[PDB]
Design a binder for these strands. Structure first.
Lengths: 100, 82, 167, 252, 64, 135
RNA sequence: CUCCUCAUGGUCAGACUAUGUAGGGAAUUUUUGGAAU
């Protein structure tokens, strides 16, 4: 539900998703399915990947995007009649000043 | 306010059925539903406990007198699942 | 088919603007696979492509710039949109900060001589070269002035590894 | 290195006071002489480290038997970040608020080291000067040499030239330390007694050692103080980072 | 008043350590430009004068 | 066990179950023994250990953990904030507590729970009855 | 345990949400019965 929409908000913005490495160099004591309890978590297909290029590359793959869409909707596939850069770009300046 | 009050306000504009404390059933289009369950109804077909059926144009029944309502299934989707 | 190599921009292909080596360094780089292309941008989207760069002391130094520029190429938005994005939003000063040389090197790669509009874009970039701006750049670390990078860029053959033609 | 070996080595520190001796200097009434109790010293040794320098301030007042005698009643342990052979220390404490302070004068400060010197080193002299620059010229220092089996109390004074040297030369300055010499230092008169005792003052947060808290320590900054029992150099309160790293080892 | 000051300085200590902790989590002119383009443009006119001088030497070679 | 570590390999986890059941016992015994002996250094640390066996946490983990209603994000934030506990306890204004814990939400709850945490203004006046006896 | 009121801290342009030494949940639309036979 709403928590699933927050999960969406997570797997959408990568800047926060980019870092699962916050442990940096650390020792953690304990067929990719239902998670390995370690590695990189993909909840959409329920797979965890021990390396970064596999985690992001799988995300760039179609199947992971197909499952991500089948969860709810198809925003990933979603002209420019000048309102895109006028209104959207103006929202980039506005939101940029709001964050700054 | 009540969550079922919120649903019942969503039910406005649909065709609902109402059973009162007397047992008479009023089926029709719900115009208005107050917070107190007072409901305004249109083009009502009424079935009495004896089985006789009548037609009336505009009816308004008090909340307290309503046993229960049946509302269309469209509303079941959301947002009351949360 | 090597990479995507689609569309338009001087009658051959769009991705031919950048060498194979550096282009595959980017397409094999992390930043491209994470924050860009179809799954990140919901298909090709110029405004969300700008959401990525604008979203990126500042951490982003003029790898990420090579990549975002490359996706600007491959998407190839409208010259009109270039005009708006260049001249709008004067009520905020943090918006065009690193977007300047990005939209600049972009049109620097695009075409060499719509034509008159492109020339107006170039002379406006000359005005901004006179605007006296300062920025930092990395590969080593070198801070460079907009007047040096714009003039030295138009007069210079290679820029940060990518060759240029003469307009 | 790190916490494990030195912290485990800390338990044996009570053994270092079984034998206590100093090279006995001639006793002279001309200059003021200090009387230090055996318990405060012992507690300071316990809290201190085998390698890293631990240093507190020391306070007291002149007794009415001899005004020239200075009894050290109150040790004041202060915010600091220690290294091997060097330490960073906060300002002079403002302790007027506490009770049992009726004009307690600032006598000096005390510190630990492992090297046997007849003089004060650069890292020590510079720190001394930075503490007492314009504030008290005649304050003293207690340099405790510590090694397994015995400790040694080496007291020192300072002249007006050393303060200037410390003002000019703070960071590095090994050659100007070599030139500076041990000449400025003069061996102060210190005694160790069981006939009097004393107490500790500690910061309000009750963490005096900022070793692993690098962001929280401020070399000039205000702190509230209170009476209490000081903790070990490696103690659970001083090592919070380790627990998040310890549970973070298994993760989640 | 003294107690309020203690609570205050304490709040500032906590907040400052909080901003510092956030930092730890994150870790885990114009005349010189105009004169510069003047010397650079002078270098461009010097290069064009060098190419024109080379064409002059070639014209002298053709005349000889 | 003090740090709340459940384990995969369950041999260790069985041993730590044994330690779970008998640990607070043994520690509490040691504490009482030292208290009878009249020893100052061990008794305080042992009392902290006993508390840690009872409530399953360290000193460096904030005491807000042992509240049932205090949330997880807040306790993480305080653990990571590197702040003396006395300061948080001295804070009064609820909005000011929310600002101090840098999350605006839950601040009022936190302050309520603080006033539910033990806080003592304690004073003592000693005085001799005679030379040997001191009241 | 739940709903309201109030207080509150936060967020948004009155609403929403956590907490509370708080008040409350017998006089017409709900919980102190018009039911009983």
């Amino acid at each position: 539900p709403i928590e699933l929409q927050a999960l969406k908000s997570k797997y959408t913005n990568y800047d926060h998703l980019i870092k699962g490495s916050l442990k940096d160099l650390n020792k953690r004591k304990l067929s990719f399915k239902r998670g390995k309890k370690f590695g990189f978590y993909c909840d959409i297909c329920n797979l965890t990947f021990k390396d970064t290029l596999q985690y992001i590359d799988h995300l760039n793959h179609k199947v992971h995007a197909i499952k991500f869409e089948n969860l709810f909707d198809e925003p990933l596939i979603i002209d420019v009649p000048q309102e895109e850069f006028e209104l959207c770009y103006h929202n980039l300046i506005k939101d940029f000043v709001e964050v700054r | 306010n009540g969550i079922p009050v919120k649903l019942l306000n969503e039910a406005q504009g649909h065709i609902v059925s109402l059973e009162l404390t007397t047992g008479a059933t009023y089926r029709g289009k719900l115009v208005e539903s107050e917070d107190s369950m007072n409901v305004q109804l249109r083009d009502v077909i009424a079935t009495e406990p004896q089985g006789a059926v009548t037609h009336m144009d505009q009816i308004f029944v008090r909340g307290s007198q309503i046993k229960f309502i049946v509302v269309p299934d469209l509303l079941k989707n959301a947002p009351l699942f949360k | 088919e090597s990479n995507i190599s689609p569309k338009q921009l001087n009658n051959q292909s769009v991705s031919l603007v950048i060498p194979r080596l550096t282009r595959d360094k980017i397409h094999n780089s992390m930043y491209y696979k994470v924050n860009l292309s179809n799954e990140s941008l919901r298909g090709n989207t110029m405004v969300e492509l700008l959401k990525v760069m604008i979203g990126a002391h500042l951490h982003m130094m003029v790898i990420e710039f090579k990549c975002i520029l490359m996706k600007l190429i491959e998407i190839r938005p409208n010259f009109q949109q270039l005009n708006f994005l260049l001249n709008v939003k004067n009520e905020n000063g943090f918006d065009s900060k690193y977007i300047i040389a990005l939209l600049l090197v972009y049109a620097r790669l695009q075409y060499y001589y719509e034509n008159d509009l492109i020339k107006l874009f170039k002379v406006q970039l000359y005005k901004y070269s006179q605007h006296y701006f300062k920025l930092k750049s990395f590969p080593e670390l070198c801070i460079i002035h907009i007047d040096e990078l714009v003039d030295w860029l138009a007069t210079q053959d290679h820029i940060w590894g990518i060759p240029l033609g003469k307009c | 290195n790190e916490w494990r070996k030195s912290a485990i080595a800390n338990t044996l520190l009570y053994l270092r006071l079984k034998n206590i001796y100093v090279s006995a200097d001639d006793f002279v009434e001309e200059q003021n002489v200090y009387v230090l109790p055996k318990n405060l010293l012992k507690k300071f040794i316990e809290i201190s480290d085998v390698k890293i320098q631990v240093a507190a301030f020391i306070y007291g007042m002149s007794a009415k038997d001899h005004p020239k005698v200075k009894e050290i009643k109150t040790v004041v342990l202060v915010p600091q970040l220690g290294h091997v052979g060097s330490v960073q220390i906060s300002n002079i404490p403002d302790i007027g608020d506490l009770p049992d302070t009726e004009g307690l004068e600032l006598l000096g400060w005390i510190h630990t080291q492992t090297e046997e010197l007849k003089f004060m080193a650069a890292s020590e002299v510079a720190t001394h000067s930075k503490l007492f620059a314009d504030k008290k010229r005649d304050c003293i220092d207690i340099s405790i040499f510590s090694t397994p089996g015995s400790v040694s109390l080496s007291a020192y004074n300072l002249t007006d030239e050393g303060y200037q040297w410390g003002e000019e030369n703070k960071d590095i300055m090994n050659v100007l330390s070599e030139g500076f010499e041990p000449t400025f230092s003069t061996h102060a008169q210190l005694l160790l007694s069981d006939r009097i005792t004393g107490n500790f003052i500690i910061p309000s947060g009750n963490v005096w050692n900022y070793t692993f808290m690098g962001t929280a320590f401020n070399q000039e900054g205000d702190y509230n103080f209170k009476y209490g029992i000081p903790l070990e150099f490696y103690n659970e309160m001083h090592r919070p980072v380790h627990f998040l790293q310890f549970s973070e080892l298994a993760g989640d | 008043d003294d107690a309020r000051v203690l609570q205050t300085k304490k709040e500032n200590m906590i907040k400052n350590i909080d901003k510092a902790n956030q930092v730890a989590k994150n870790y885990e002119d114009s005349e010189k430009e105009r004169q510069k383009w003047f010397e650079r443009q002078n270098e461009r006119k010097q290069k064009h004068r060098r190419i024109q001088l080379a064409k002059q030497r070639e014209s002298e070679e053709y005349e000889a | 066990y003090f740090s709340q570590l459940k384990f995969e390999g369950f041999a260790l986890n069985s041993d730590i179950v044994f330690i779970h059941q008998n640990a607070g016992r043994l520690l509490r015994a040691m504490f009482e023994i030292c208290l009878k002996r009249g020893w100052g250094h061990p008794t305080r640390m042992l009392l902290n250990l006993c508390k840690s066996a009872t409530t399953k946490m360290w000193p460096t983990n904030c005491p807000l953990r042992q509240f049932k209603t205090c949330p997880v994000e807040v306790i993480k934030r305080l653990e990571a904030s590197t702040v003396p506990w006395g300061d948080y306890l001295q804070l009064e204004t609820p909005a000011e507590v929310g600002r101090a814990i840098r999350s605006e939400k839950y601040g009022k709850q936190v302050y309520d729970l603080l006033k539910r945490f033990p806080k003592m203004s304690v004073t003592c006046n000693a005085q001799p009855i005679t030379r040997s006896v001191m009241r």
